């Protein structure tokens, strides 16, 4: 039936997810649990270990690091979007608006793969920067990353897979309720198909878990505000720091947005 076409969509997206994003949740958890024959990542807990870590101002340096990686994330996400059947056939200005609002929602979503209670995998799973260390940074940078950690501890509880995430992400990108879209119909047309693919995915991949799908759509709505909060703290950081240069691509996104 249609059920087959939805499984077909799921695999397509997973495959383009796995191509587009080099460090999967599976790879990431394997590192974090230690259940791997790779060397455990260089832990970063203070300014000293940061400095020894650089091999493989401080708070500005870290945020500059965070920023250069955000841009690579946007590049990867934009590449993945193009693989979502029919995303490219949309109006190019819509394509831009969907990405503009989506990327930070997805960055949060996928960061959670990379983190746990105590810290976050960095530099393609080779560094492990602690939550204690990021808190300890001075305002405004102290509490920049903490909200991501708080989200991630709840989101990760849902125990989603790379296959689940691939579709979830596609669903977030194709949200027809973004400010300034010009042709909402075809966006919604695809988000319907994706949501169905998502519902089936969860039923098949997690038959033990009922209403993961419902729980998961509830998270997707938290995320929009969490992303708003985040965008506001960028507005704070841009203004109060004369020494801090925002990256262009991040401006493009930040500008006019909430």
């Amino acid at each position: 039936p249609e059920s087959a076409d939805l499984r077909a969509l799921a695999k397509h997206l997973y495959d383009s997810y796995i191509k587009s994003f080099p460090l999967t949740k599976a790879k990431a958890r394997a590192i974090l649990t230690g259940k791997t024959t790779d060397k455990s990542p260089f832990v970063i807990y203070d300014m000293n270990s940061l400095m020894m870590g650089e091999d493989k101002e401080v708070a500005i340096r870290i945020f500059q690091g965070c920023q250069f990686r955000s841009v690579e994330a946007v590049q990867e996400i934009t590449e993945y979007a193009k693989s979502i059947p029919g995303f490219v056939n949309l109006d190019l200005n819509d394509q831009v608006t969907l990405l503009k609002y989506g990327v930070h929602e997805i960055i949060y979503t996928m960061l959670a793969s990379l983190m746990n209670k105590d810290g976050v995998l960095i530099s393609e799973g080779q560094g492990f920067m602690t939550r204690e260390f990021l808190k300890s940074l001075r305002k405004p940078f102290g509490d920049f990353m903490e909200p991501k950690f708080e989200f991630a501890v709840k989101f990760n509880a849902l125990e989603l897979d790379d296959s689940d995430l691939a579709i979830f992400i596609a669903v977030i990108i194709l949200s027809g309720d973004r400010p300034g879209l010009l042709n909402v119909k075809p966006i919604e047309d695809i988000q319907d198909n994706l949501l169905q693919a998502l519902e089936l995915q969860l039923k098949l991949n997690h038959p033990e878990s009922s209403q993961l799908f419902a729980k998961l759509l509830q998270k997707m709505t938290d995320l929009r505000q969490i992303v708003t909060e985040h965008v506001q703290l960028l507005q704070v950081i841009k203004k109060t720091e004369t020494d801090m240069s925002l990256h262009p691509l991040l401006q493009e996104i930040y500008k006019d947005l909430y």
Binding site: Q75, T78, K82, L92, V96, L99, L249, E252
Partner: peptide, 9 residues
């Protein structure tokens, strides 16, 4: 939004 357009194409 140049870069985004450039990235999209």
């Amino acid at each position: 939004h140049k870069i985004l357009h450039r990235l999209l194409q």
